[PDB]
Ligand binder design. Structure first.
Ligand SMILES: O=C(O)[C@@]1(O)C[C@@H](O)[C@H](O)[C@@H]2O[C@@H]21
Length: 252
């Protein structure tokens, strides 16, 4: 799709959309964070479910989703379990990971889910098709918190997500140099101009990669993450400062 419309939001045109991550270890924490987040300005709420420390209970997770909706009933909601090996707080079985995403989809509470590409092709393609049958969008994702792959590897990774039916391919990579930031910006622009028929989200993390979080309108990332009080990955800046920069670039 040229653009992904979610609620009142067009992803893939105009200024990149601003995502913040909500991180709560229990239901009381999730409630407090949701009430604090609704006094910040952003386009999409990501719920980082891997920070929730009663992950074994599917209904506990759904109860926490309902509290987020009690506080922010309408905001586009992205449900993300991030595995430890890709930057997250814990590891679950493949079966439970698919059960949590199926429950999220079935709840009617969530607009998008995050699926990690390296979960495995048959499992990812099934959850994509399930999401789509329930009018839920899929951000398919991959993360490297240690290094930056070649531009060719990043393009082919994003293309494989597209091939598996991802609405919005996403990749986050860690620069070890400033040249690595250019590699990520080059891959991004190759997707937007040539290899993608849908929006992509991309970022080079850490301080060196901050420009990648600001320059989406230029090089073709459709969304960008900011911090309300606490970053969910290195390089996220204050969401008001992020908004300031996006508006200056949009307006020249
Ligand atoms: O902004 C980043 O660098 C992230 O690692 C944060 C994640 O919470 C989020 O799901 C996006 O994977 C990106």
């Amino acid at each position: 799709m040229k653009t992904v419309t979610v609620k009142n939001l067009i992803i893939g045109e105009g200024m990149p959309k601003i995502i913040v991550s909500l991180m709560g270890r229990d239901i009381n924490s999730v409630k407090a964070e949701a009430l604090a987040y609704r006094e910040a300005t952003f386009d999409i709420l990501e719920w980082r479910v891997d920070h929730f420390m009663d992950i074994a209970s599917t209904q506990s997770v759904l109860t926490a989703a309902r509290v987020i909706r009690d506080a922010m009933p309408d905001i586009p909601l992205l449900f993300t379990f991030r595995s430890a090996k890709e930057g997250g707080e814990q590891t679950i079985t493949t079966q439970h990971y698919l059960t949590l995403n199926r429950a999220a989809i079935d709840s009617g509470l969530v607009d998008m889910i995050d699926l990690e590409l390296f979960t495995g092709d048959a499992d990812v393609k099934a959850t994509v098709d399930y999401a789509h049958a329930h009018n839920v969008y899929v951000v398919m994702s991959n993360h490297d918190f240690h290094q930056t792959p070649s531009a060719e590897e990043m393009v082919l990774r994003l293309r494989k997500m597209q091939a598996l039916g991802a609405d919005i391919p996403k990749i986050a990579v860690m620069p070890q140099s400033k040249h690595d930031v250019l590699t990520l910006l080059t891959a991004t622009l190759e997707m937007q101009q040539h290899y993608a028929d849908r929006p992509v989200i991309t970022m080079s993390m850490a301080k060196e990669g901050v420009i990648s979080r600001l320059a989406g309108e230029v090089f073709g990332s459709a969304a960008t993450f900011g911090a309300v009080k606490q970053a969910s990955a290195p390089g996220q800046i204050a969401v008001n400062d992020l908004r300031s920069v996006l508006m200056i670039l949009h307006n020249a």
